Amino acid sequence: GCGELVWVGEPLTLRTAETITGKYGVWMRDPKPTYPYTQETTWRIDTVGTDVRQVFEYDIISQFMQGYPSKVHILPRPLESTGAVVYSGSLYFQGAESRTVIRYELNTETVKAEKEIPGAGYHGQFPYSWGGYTDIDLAVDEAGLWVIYSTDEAKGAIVLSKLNPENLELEQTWETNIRKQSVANAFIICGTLYTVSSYTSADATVNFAYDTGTGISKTLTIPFKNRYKYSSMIDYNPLEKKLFAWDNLNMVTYDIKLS
Ligand SMILES: [Ca+2]
Ligand code: NA
């Protein structure tokens, strides 16, 4: 059941990092789970620092919320920032100090594909408003895998491209009029890109939308609360139909409603 985003619920805290290494990070589930994982499997990456390689994996939700990881993967190359996603058995992440997206198959711990995002800024050229080298933000929605970025040709406006999940080729590209560094983060629901106005405010909003199906841009005023005042990661999971976010040590989730 697709539709336009009309409401975001209150953030629910599922886990809190215990060290500064997890001030920012990304946590995620696979909306297209594949053996040996399930819809309960959760991954967590604490992303502070310069040689981020540890990916914590939890087989079931209770372990993610209360226990130790069931497995730790050591990535073969350091990861950049908070934009990564898991999709159909692979972690898609950006190589540190690069515009390269890497497909890392989790079960086999194998790199299956790598792609430079053509023309994408990286390492602080088109971050979201908080910085954090957030130039490249992967996304999964009801239609599959996407990447959110910008380029010099787009003058820093958000660009989004649909990606082939097997080989990382770009399938189609859209250019918005939204300055990427003017918004706190972004995510895609049902082919519409949404942005969040602030990473600090308890009274932020989902403030812009761009519908890739119609080409129409809109302003919105949907309330969005940063409970802990520093949201470094905001993504959408189309299986759960929820937002997943990382806010100042806290892994949080928001319910949503679509028209
Ligand atoms: Ca995002
Ligand atoms: Na992302």
Residue numbers in the entry: 244 to 502
Sentences from the paper on this structure:
Inherited missense mutations in the myocilin (MYOC) gene, within its olfactomedin (OLF) domain, constitute the strongest genetic link to primary open-angle glaucoma via a toxic gain of function, and thus MYOC is an attractive precision-medicine target. Myocilin has no known function, and there is no glaucoma phenotype in Myoc knockout mice or in individuals with a homozygous N-terminal truncation mutation or hemizygous deletion of MYOC, but rare non-synonymous coding mutations lead to toxic intracellular sequestration of misfolded myocilin. However, not all mutations in MYOC cause glaucoma, and common variants are expected to be neutral polymorphisms. Among the common features associated with pathogenic myocilin misfolding, we demonstrate that a single metric, OLF thermal stability, can robustly segregate benign from early-onset disease variants.
Overall, nine variants (T256M, R296H, L303I, S313F, V329M, S331L, E352K, A427T, and V499I) were considered likely to be benign. Assessment of spent media from cells expressing each of the 16 full-length myocilin variants revealed WT-like secretion for T256M, R296H, L303I, S313F, V329M, S331L, T353I, A445V, V449I and K500R. Structural integrity was further confirmed by high-resolution crystal structures, which were solved for 11 OLF variants. No gross changes from WT OLF were detected for the structures of T293K, R296H, L303I, V329M, S331L, E352K, T353I, K398R, A445V, V449I or K500R, indicating that these mutations are accommodated within the native five-bladed β-propeller fold and do not perturb the dinuclear calcium-containing site. In addition to the five variants that we predicted initially to be benign (T293K, T353I, K398R, A445V and K500R), our study reveals seven more (T256M, R296H, L303I, V329M, S331L, E352K and V499I) that are indistinguishable from WT OLF across multiple assays. Thus, our data indicate these should also be considered benign.
